[PDB]
Design a protein around this ligand. Structure first.
Ligand SMILES: C=C(C)[C@@H]1[C@H]2OC(=O)[C@@H]1[C@]1(O)C[C@H]3O[C@]34C(=O)O[C@H]2[C@]14C
Ligand SMILES: CC(=O)N[C@@H]1[C@@H](O)[C@H](O)[C@@H](CO)O[C@H]1O
Ligand SMILES: CC(=O)N[C@@H]1[C@@H](O)[C@H](O)[C@@H](CO)O[C@H]1O
Ligand SMILES: CC(=O)N[C@@H]1[C@@H](O)[C@H](O)[C@@H](CO)O[C@H]1O
Ligand SMILES: CC(=O)N[C@@H]1[C@@H](O)[C@H](O)[C@@H](CO)O[C@H]1O
Ligand SMILES: CC(=O)N[C@@H]1[C@@H](O)[C@H](O)[C@@H](CO)O[C@H]1O
Lengths: 352, 352, 352, 352, 352
């Protein structure tokens, strides 16, 4: 019967009165646009610059009174991806976006559909680097919230309003996991608005939730720091007759603790406030230091006993310091370590 | 006789009724497309971000009822690379793709052929960075699987279906080797499918297999860690009369072991679970530590003997600890090292 | 009534006598252009290369005698973003600009408006990397000034003059903070001019003010350096009977101080003059060194007493050095540390 | 007389029967193309990723029966660089190419010439990053071979064959030197061929030769490693009366040797086989270790003599070990160092 | 009177006989082009890859017999930046150029002027990364010469010749300074020529002069190395009675000197020849080593005296070595340090 290319030229082109530079249903209530977001591949989240790489598909549907053929026997039509200028897709930008170039492999990576009523389907895979203002109040637990702000640019609130969907809000790629964080399935979403000096613009957003999968942090720094503290404890028992060995153990244990505390913040961005690591390393450096101090006091009692040679009293005092020291370090460390964990587990359960 | 450019304009252009925006054999069974993949140069695999750089050639053949001249005396025709829009090549994208720009040196790097029946040949060299979800369950052996997902975008299962080839599936560049891994020639391949909220899309894949060429890992960390353990063993024999020297050997051996264990995970991505290196380094740090501990006990027996001066008994006990220690360390290390290797060689042979 | 696309073609196109390649009100006084700057997202400031990444919106208004319809009942019209060549927007470039590519997500990210009189509205989100000549006279306080130079290129002072606005000068994105610096709200602004060998060109600028949010610097280097100094002080009290231990403490404390002083300048760019850190580290390395020196003198008095065995006098002198040393170090350190802070707090209050 | 632009339009355009999409002398023997390569600037060779940056000029000449005016009085004509599509330059790609974008400063950086017979001249400066499979069998000498593979894409052996030149093959930029390697002037060249599954394609290549300019390697690692070995030798002579000092010298010399051996492979790519550095560092670490071992044996003889107090015999044995040790280390090191150099100098002279 | 756009279309377009693809004054003496260079912002000079980033403005003037209106009452006309193809600007490329993309902020960043006679003005801000072959014969002083080679591509010496200017040669941005180097105002300039295998091409150049602003280098490495040497000197005076302490001081001072000498060449590119730093560090490592050696000899005299117990003679010899050592080190260091500075200050004054 009729040719498909003849019908495609009759629908969009010189036969069509619309030039596509005018918004559909002009001088009428703004046409809402439904946006479904599918995450092709989450990951590559940069912690030192507070950003993340994600490619979404951005399928958007709107209705127009134009482009209603109502003469083909099927429900929808799969259009070419070379007719993108005739559709007049709406404007959309991200307000926290870095880079975000398009994709091009053998064609434009775009989808196009059109039904009898005018409901269209237009999805585009775009790799988006987005800046997120993560709050690193506690570095190991580190509940983070990542956002994406779907915003228009040039069409006001009384001209173009975006909206979400009701059958599914944000889908995710099947069988995708992240080593750094586990993606929460809550997918809390809502929408704000913008008030600039030129008008009222719509701003639709979506909030993600990322918690740290603990394990790596413990092996990398919690386990070495612990062993280092343990080494200091053994020093008292390791050396009794000769003092030098204890001195040098305590010196280099403090130096390697400061080296590890300096090396732990290399991947971290520069921030003013104090994290949990910056409490843990400081208190373990306090313990190792304090032990060395205790040692200085023991050598002072020994030097007083040497310059005196009350001999029994001095020996007794030294022995007492030695036997009280070693008993005291585990209880003051165990109570603190357990206390720290409880004071962070209960704030984790209060946050979650 | 007839001019070639006149025939080329008669075949594609104003004389041709097709505009090339319509799929061939429209309102008919989907035209399958045969895909042959040739790897120009594998390599540059990034371990810290789980990706790899590869340039394939992507020769794809399909048949159309149009573009059948049946008037030239030869079988096929070599077309210009400026007539790419007239062919209407099918859409194809990769679902795990980062970047992947085109190549441009003096022309478009594209091939074009057309036969009397309509079987075309279209290959394109594209440098593709693809993200692979490698599982680093054992870091030194590390059997990995890399995939490439040939997928359409805009044409459903009842509109366009891709397929593989039967005379050769994935070819590889002659005389190409990789320092990091040796490419398996098994080339296991199959194809999945996709079910989105818009329709059923085809997804053709191909699985590669990469195992680590062992050697470098052994020289870099297995040999230094071993020597370090050996150094600790010699300490007992190195120093008998004077205790300090043993103390300081054990301290710095533990500190350099923790330094090497911290420096070994710099190229590694942050991951929660425990690798074979994280067992080996932990057990060797246990051995070196344990030796230092044993030493603390020896100095405690020596200090008890000093504060007593049962003298013979104390000397005998110290001698016993010294002679049992040194006998015990090799057997408990050799049995463990051999055990570890057997428990990883048999899981390597069970995986392969 | 009349069609909107017919009116849009009548206003700009073949019906319009202007080709848009001629400046509005040609052979007349230069048309001034009002520029409002909104900072979408400040941050990612590079300290080692003296630059910063910022995306502004750059809304610019000018009046033209052309494009005055005076026939529609509304005040303004929202034009398409495909008619950008018909407006003839003015030239604008930044004189300290690196890179600064455009943005492209589904359309041109541009705004276009036109009123009855001719006052237009044109804003463009452009991610601008700008080079700022920061003066690092004092590294921890580090009051910096960042500038952006709005400059024309091709239109002289008697041809095109830019100007600022009176209802708001530079706006900023609501709820945006920077970890490195806190943005001052003073927003001091003025404008310079340029005199090249081709003519007089306008150059409009805006000055920002960035001070360091102190805290991170103190934890990272001030607290470790302090502890190191404290360790040296304890050495005198730690060891009295045996000299070696003090020697080795002082050696490695000097070596780790030089290591920390070398590692502190890794993020810093290479600069000739002396910062506050380069005074602090040098004076603390002086203190630790001086202590070791004092120690050398004590061992010289001890060796003189040994080669003599005036015995009482030598013992008294050694004791005196030991008791004067330890009293002297805190007062000469506390007076200096307080002095340094006062001499930098008062220059901070004099700068602010 | 006649206008030049009129003649340029008559030669190429609507008057010309060729559309330029057809190969010259179609249905005739393939037109060979002469390729002269000039290296504008060699350098920036990456060792960790096995690639190098080079910009060649790629002047290519071919003859066509068309475009023969034979009416101007001069020999050749210098055409515009905007008429590149009318010439129909042949296809050319590199089979080991990464990136390789074009250059653009104020025009297309292209040359165009045409003579009366039809011999054209077309050169293009293109910065080419090319991957070379260097074999690092011996790291310090390291004779490497870099290749460039000029290959067609779309025109078979019976359609288009490339060839080299006879008056000069590959020229090089005057007064250009490389710090890493000295470019050999031999410039050995030949050509292979390709056999794919679609046809026979020509592949013309050129081989370069790069040897390491020795010196830097010697200062950076050979001289420090030597000094370290020397330090170990002095230890025996440095300490005789007291054993600790020797113990600690040997410990830290082994630790700094392992640190230097770990730090030497940072710029190196990960490779399985053993280089000359990995023999040198291993044998010097063996020497330093062995010395420490010898020392353990001396302390065992000393402890046996202590637990005995045959006294003369034990003292004599210790003295003998001390005097045999120090005599033995230089001869066993000098013979080995000279042997290593001879066994690498003669394989260098056999390779060259 | 007459319209400006009508005159602009009459001057360039269909009324003009020239197509702009032909050089002005064809079959006549080559039109020279005057080039004035203004440096917008020098800086970001990379030392490890021998390059630098600079954006010049490149204002070029040439005369043509065409485009002479001689009918407007003014001297010059400010043309649009959309008519760049009608002017036929000459070709220009840089022979040592990497990257160098164009700038694009709201328009083309180009200037265009035309007078009654035909003298045009065309400037373009282009950020140019240029490779300079710096000779690092002496690393701290380091007089460097940076060049820019203005060269044509496609027009021979008898077709197009570039030239410099007489009223100003290379201008620089007012109030611009560089932390690394101070720009010399001599601005020595001349021009070479090129002789390829296709013809004689013009090549105009300009030489800059960059010397290091000394200060940073001294603080970073000269001051730490000095202190380290000083520490070694104090060792002799620090320890007299006990030998171990001196041994360990000398060991770790040699180890930290080798660490600092290894860490000093990290920013440096790999080069074969010997710099001033590689003499200074080697001679200071010689001094520290030599001191340790001297010490070995002292302990040998002490061990000979111990195995003898000529007693007075041995004590006297040891005392003599101790008192000659300490006197000798400053004079042999001061004479050398002063000598080195004089031998580099006089070669600096001979170079300048
Ligand atoms: C951390 C260092 C470098 C110290 C230094 O002085 C010490 O106390 C540490 C010790 O580890 C430990 C010891 O042997 C070392 C030595 O001789 O000095 C050094 C060695 C290496
Ligand atoms: C849920 C909702 O408010 N939907 C709106 C509707 O109110 C409005 O009339 C229409 C105009 O096209 O756009 C959509
Ligand atoms: C093996 C196979 O199924 N091949 C299919 C065929 O069934 C189908 O009829 C044809 C339609 O063009 O496409 C191809
Ligand atoms: C405040 C001010 O000077 N505004 C100027 C005005 O003087 C000038 O007449 C006009 C010309 O269009 O441009 C604007
Ligand atoms: C040396 C050589 O073989 N040159 C060939 C020639 O044989 C061939 O006839 C010609 C066809 O154009 O192309 C060239
Ligand atoms: C100083 C100089 O040589 N200027 C030359 C002139 O000699 C030449 O005649 C002219 C041709 O246009 O180009 C210019």
């Amino acid at each position: 019967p009729m040719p498909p290319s003849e019908f495609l030229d009759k629908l969009m082109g010189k036969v069509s009165g619309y030039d596509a530079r005018i918004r559909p249903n002009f001088k009428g209530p703004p046409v809402n646009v439904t946006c479904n977001i599918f995450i092709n591949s989450f990951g590559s989240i940069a912690e030192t610059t507070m950003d993340y790489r994600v490619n979404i598909f951005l399928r958007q549907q709107w209705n127009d009174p134009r482009l209603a053929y109502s003469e083909y026997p099927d429900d929808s039509l799969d259009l070419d991806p070379s007719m993108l200028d005739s559709i007049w897709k709406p404007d959309l930008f991200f307000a926290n976006e870095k880079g975000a170039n398009f994709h091009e492999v053998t064609t434009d990576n775009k989808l196009l559909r059109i039904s009898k009523n005018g409901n269209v389907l237009y999805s585009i895979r775009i790799t988006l680097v987005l800046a997120c203002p993560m709050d690193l109040k506690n570095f190991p637990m580190d509940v983070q919230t990542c956002i994406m702000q779907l915003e228009s640019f040039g069409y006001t609130m009384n001209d173009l309003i975006f909206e979400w969907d009701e059958k599914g809000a944000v889908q995710v790629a099947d069988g995708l996991t992240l080593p750094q964080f586990i993606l929460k399935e809550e997918k809390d979403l809502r929408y704000c608005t913008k008030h600039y000096n030129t008008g009222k613009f719509t701003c639709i957003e979506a909030r993600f939730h990322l918690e740290r999968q603990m394990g790596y942090y413990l092996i990398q720094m919690y386990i070495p720091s612990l062993l280092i503290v343990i080494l200091s404890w053994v020093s008292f028992w390791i050396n009794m007759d000769a003092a030098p060995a204890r001195v040098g153990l305590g010196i280099t244990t403090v130096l390697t603790m400061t080296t590890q505390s300096s090396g732990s913040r290399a991947s971290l961005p520069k921030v003013s406030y104090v994290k949990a690591i910056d409490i843990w390393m400081a208190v373990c450096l306090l313990f190792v230091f304090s032990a060395l101090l205790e040692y200085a006091a023991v050598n002072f009692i020994a030097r007083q006993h040497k310059e005196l040679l009350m001999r029994k009293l001095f020996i007794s005092r030294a022995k007492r310091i030695d036997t009280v020291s070693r008993v005291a370090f585990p209880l003051v460390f165990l109570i603190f370590n357990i206390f720290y964990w409880i004071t962070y587990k209960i704030i984790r359960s209060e946050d979650i």
